[PDB]
Each structure stands twice: as structure tokens, then as C-alpha cells.
Subunit: 275 residues, 3 copies
């Protein structure tokens, strides 16, 4: 049997149960959200994860296959480090770490025949190989003084159950395959340099990629889906999203008031610099 088979286990007039058994190259990537509190610059608000899309195009056995992957994390632990109540001590209100109790979700999609009209799926199963995700080096750019660097962190992702999901984005909506990963803490630990914290396992949520373009893991998946017998039917993929108009309005009002305040401030500095 080919590595990229496609078989029919039942076929009525309009519908047909098509089996698919195919190899895949999941190339995903974390993405971090860094919110820094105001004042001088010595207090950071959040260092968390954001679901991250990554579209690529790889080579199958004489075919070019475009893909779309989306990495997310669930059940992460919220740590924090506060060394003083004054505006000049380095503090991080809340930063996220990954351990055993957390999980790493990866939605995957391709331009192949398996994902063209997939809305129903049974007999789902996959053979995935394990990889090692290592964190990088994030230099907290303080206004003045020293520059602590959050450096280190290694954690091994192991295959787990598989499910379905939907990758929503501002361009495409994809009925996609959801691969789960569990975590086993590894030897390289992450530590904030020039600080009283070190030798704690996990992965940091500042620079997980470690300056990499992606994390690669190869796999195979096997399912049975409902596809119309005619191989010309198409399910809507693209999107045109206008969600959270109330949020857009809130942001517009905030920008208006912020421009008014900055105007008032620079006017106070202009009158105080017009002698």
C-alpha cells in the first residue's frame, strides 16, 4: 500500500465513505504576548502565550502540498516574581510556564483531498514522533541599570490523542485535525540571570522558538470521512471577518482620549517652553 493511499469503504449515489492514510510534516511555532506596565519600565504586566498560525509549503513524493498549522497551549501554570514595591525594582506580575499538567494543541490542515470537504470523521488515529522544545533568551530591556535575561528551558513533547478542530483566522476557516501533545520536563532549566531565581523546570513564554523558524515533527494519520461522490464539490474556506466591532469602538474611543491627553501634555510642555 502507498504511503498516501485513498480508498473507498462504501459508496451510495451522492455520498461515499472515503478512507485516507497519509504522511504529514507538522511545522508549527509558538508565539508570545508581552505586555509591559507603565511608569518607568521596571514592571511587566503579562508574559503569556498567543495561538499562532503558520502556513508553509512542503514537498510530498513528487507533489507540492501547501499546509496551514496553528499552535496553542492549555493548562499552563502562572508564576510571578516581585522583588519590591518601589518603581525601581524589576517585577513581573504574571508569566506563563509549561509542565506535565499542561498540554500543547496543534491544529493541522493541507490542500490535499483529505481536507477538501471534511466535516465528518471516524476511525481516527495517528502515529507521531516526539520532539524537544527548547526556550530561548529574552533580554528584559530595563530603562536603566542591569539587563536580566530569561534564558533556558527545555521540555519534550510526546504524542497523545487526536481529535478534530476548526482553525479560525481573518483569511481562511479550516476544518482541521487536532493533534495533542503532553510534556515531560527535560534537564535544561530556565533561569532569570542577575536575579534570585534558577533551577526550575519548564519552558518560558517569552522566546519559546529559540530563534527558530518553526518546530518540525513528522507524522501519519488515518481516517474515514464523508465526501460527495462527485469529485467537484467545494466547502467554503476563505473568510471576511468583522467580529468585535464593540472592541474596535472601545479602542477608537481610547485612542481619541489618549490623543487628547498627549495633546494636553505636549501643550503644557510647549507653554512651559515658550518664554
Amino acid at each position: 500500500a502507498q504511503a498516501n493511499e485513498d480508498i473507498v469503504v462504501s459508496k451510495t449515489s451522492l455520498w461515499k465513505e472515503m478512507q485516507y492514510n497519509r504522511d504529514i510534516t507538522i511545522r508549527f511555532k509558538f508565539a508570545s504576548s508581552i505586555v509591559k506596565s507603565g511608569g518607568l519600565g521596571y514592571k511587566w504586566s503579562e508574559i503569556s502565550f498567543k495561538p499562532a498560525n503558520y502556513q508553509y509549503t512542503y514537498t510530498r513524493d513528487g507533489e507540492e502540498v501547501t499546509a496551514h498549522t496553528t499552535c496553542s497551549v492549555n493548562g499552563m501554570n502562572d508564576f510571578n516574581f516581585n522583588g519590591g514595591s518601589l518603581p525601581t525594582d524589576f517585577v513581573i506580575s504574571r508569566y506563563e510556564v509549561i509542565k506535565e499538567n499542561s498540554y500543547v494543541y496543534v491544529d493541522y490542515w493541507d490542500d490535499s483531498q483529505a481536507f477538501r470537504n471534511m466535516v465528518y470523521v471516524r476511525s481516527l488515529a495517528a502515529n507521531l514522533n516526539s520532539v524537544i522544545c527548547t526556550g530561548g533568551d529574552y533580554s528584559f530591556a530595563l530603562p536603566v541599570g542591569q539587563w536580566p535575561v530569561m534564558t533556558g528551558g527545555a521540555v519534550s513533547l510526546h504524542s497523545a490523542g487526536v481529535t478534530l478542530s476548526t482553525q479560525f483566522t481573518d483569511f481562511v476557516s479550516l476544518n482541521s485535525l487536532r493533534f495533542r501533545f503532553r510534556l515531560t520536563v527535560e534537564e535544561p532549566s530556565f533561569s532569570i540571570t542577575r536575579t534570585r531565581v534558577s533551577r526550575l523546570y519548564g519552558l518560558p513564554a517569552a522566546n519559546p522558538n529559540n530563534g527558530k523558524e518553526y518546530y518540525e515533527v513528522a507524522g501519519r494519520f488515518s481516517l474515514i470521512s464523508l465526501v460527495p461522490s462527485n469529485d467537484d464539490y467545494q466547502t467554503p474556506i476563505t473568510n471576511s471577518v468583522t467580529v468585535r466591532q464593540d472592541l474596535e469602538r472601545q479602542l477608537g474611543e481610547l485612542r481619541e482620549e489618549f490623543n487628547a491627553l498627549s495633546q494636553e501634555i505636549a501643550m503644557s510642555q510647549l507653554i512651559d517652553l515658550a518664554l
Copy 2:
């Protein structure tokens, strides 16, 4: 005939028409969005509603059924109250109130068989019982002076038409059932203490829940859906959302601007503290 039946009104080679007639306990909940303008703290920008999720797990007749509800409002009336044009007068540029002209929407979903692959439905109907919803007690936190409190408001929710809908979220996407509700004013009227306004009907948007963990209304729904005869197919439920990336970018630019302005202000405040 049972209360939670499951019938097969037809069956083809792959698909099947199934009828589902089931009892439900809609435990829903509102959620308010408050926005406080800058300046001193006597001026409020908006007090509105937001679509509010609530997931839970209730006992059926010997089954534990996990449920998921999402409330929302439409056609609400935007009242205002301005005591003057000064920084020190209490003013609320806009706050939302629920009345007869408006409608309340409640999306409902469960982990039962009626919802697993529900994409098509007909003969939809439900017999819901009416309830009462009373407003809360929201104490406007003013910087200095007395503390006005929005207190009162009671409206009875009457059952109306039933339809389908979709509960999108950052975790799950659900093909759900949409109960509609109309409103009738009641005797308890809402009013702001220490203010020249009172004896006006409706339900405030500051605290509708009245501190209740949820509002509860029982119901029953009967319908007929198209499901695959093989009860192993699964429709995609989970999500990994990255919608409004342009909005994320705008928020990042606004954070950068506000951090730079706060750093400027803090430096200008600290230069005067070196004597």
C-alpha cells in the same frame, strides 16, 4: 413515550433522519461591560452588555449531562444622564437598558446525542416557562464624595420563537439551539440613588445578575436532524482562534505609545525629586 427519547424516522445507506425530544435546564447568565472615561472619575463612557458564556454540568434522570449556554441581548435602549459639562459632576454618557422593544437571545448546547452532528434541523419547537430577572446593586466608585449606587429594575422574560445558532469561542465552536425571549416591565423600577431620576421601568446593564451565579429556566425541545447512521462520526468542536490580528497590532502600538508617554511623565515627575 419517554422524556428523553431517540427515534429514527427514516434511514438511508449512510445518513438517517432521527427525532430528538428532550428536557433541558437552561442555566444562563448575563455579563456587563463598564468603561470609565479618564480625567478625574466622575465621567463614564459606556455601560453595556457583552455576550456571556457559562458552561456547567447538571443531572438528568440518572445521567450527568454537561451543558454550555451563552446569553446576549439585542435592541436595547441607550439612555444617558448628564448633570453638567464640568469635571466634577456625575455623568454617564450612555448606558443600556432592556425593555419590551428589545429581545434576549440564549444559545444552548449539551453533550448528548441531539447535538453531536447537528447541522440540519426541522420541526423545531420548544415549550419554555417564563421567569423574572432583577437588577443588581452597582456602587459607582467615585474618586471623592458620596457613592451613587444603581439599584433596582425587574423584567419578566417571556418565551418566544426558537431557532438555531452557533456559539463560537476561543476554545470551542458549537452548533447550538437559540431560544428567543421577549420582555415585559414589572413593578420594581431601577434608579440611581442621590440623583433626580426614578420610577422608570427596565433592567439596568450595570449588574443584571443580582449577584446570582446564574438564572435558571426549564424547558423542552423537539426536533428532527440529519445524522450519519454510523454513530461514530464527530463534527469539529474545538478551535484555535487568531481573529482580529490587525486589532492585536493596533493594541500593541497603543501600548507602546502609552508606555512611552508614561515614561516621559514619570521622568518629568522624577527630575523634580532630586534636591
Copy 3:
């Protein structure tokens, strides 16, 4: 024959293949996002496009049909204009323009039968006529100085391929038809007045509607869709979205910090009015 046909090209127990061929009135609309940087008010951070919803109701040949149209743009170029490094020169960090290399997407939907349970489509085609899109006059509200006005700009929208799409919103979710448009620059150019920029082509992202209520283009489409033979099945349309809760949380922290800073500024300014 008919202009609004509905044919049955095949039929089985529960499903069927229907062919719909209908005339339509695509009344779409552009929308701009004008972000103004802080400071004094001479510096503009960005002027971009945003996907624009517009819903209406128009008269077919004795039928009154409700419709919904969502415009978007893709591949738009980013131009910039800096007059100096000072706070007092009129600078536009970025404004978006449309040209040949770019494309305009229009997702279209009606309440007619062709869209009631459309999830699968084949033999999709369309005949569209060309229209003209022209820019208005966006006067930049400079606090002091002259008044630059971005004016002009005209482009011819020529039809292109048709596909499927999904219009998502905070209210409705529509499995819609995606008409694509390619562009050819016209003679009327866009120019900012009292400024050293003119005789450059494209469409300004400032006021693309030209003060109009919509841009109307007639059309006709033909397709072949899979529908339940029982013409009573309904697919979920309405929504209740709670997406980007983390973004809402970041915006709320931003608002709290901004209110605290504004309170500090206002107390600092009020303490100097006690004589």
C-alpha cells in the same frame, strides 16, 4: 426557461442536487481605519482598510429579498510621506492604496433558497459587469496650520473568478459566495492638497466611498448544491461570539492604567488652582 430557476438535476432518499441560477444586486461598501498618533496631532500612524459589512433589502421581480454583503481588500500597497522629523510637520507613517497587483473580495449572501443550506457547491460560475470606485475628500484635522485634504483617486473594478467563503460577524454566520475583482487604474489620480505629492494613481484608503451610501454592481450566478430533499431543514446562521477574551483583558488593563494616569495628571493640574 427562467431568470431565477431552481432545477433538480438529481435526487435520492434524503439528499438531492439542485441547480440554482439567479440574478443579484451586489451593493457593497468600503471602510477605512484612520489611526492618529499621539503628540500634537501632525503625525498619523496608519490609514488602513477594514472588512466592511453592509446589509440591505432589495426588490426582485415581485419578490422582496434581504441581502448581506461584506467587502474586503488584499494585496494593498503601503505608501508613506514624511515632511520632517519635527512634531510640527504633517507626516503620514502609512496609508494604504489599491492598484493592479491587488484584488478586491466581495462576499455576498441572500435569504433565498440557494443559500439556506449551501455547504457544498460545484459548477460555480458568474457573469459580472464592471463599475467605477472613486475616492472622496478626507480633510486632516490639523490643530493649527493649513488643512491638507486627501482627494481624488479612481479605479475600475473588473470581474474575476468566483469561489465560496464564510462571512463571520458578531451576529450572523453566512456560507456566502465570494466574487473577486481585479483592478485597472483610471485617469483621476489621488492627491493630498497643499503638499508635494500629486499625479500618482490608485485609490485612497481615507474616503473610498466618495460620500456614497454604497457601490452597486449587478450580477448573475449559477451553481449546483447538495440540499436535503425535505425543503424544511435550516442551517445555523445567528451567533453569539466571545472571541479574544485575552484581548479584552489586555484592553481592560490598559484602560485601568490609562485612567490612573489621567487621574494623576488631572490632580497635578488641579492642585495649582488653589489661591
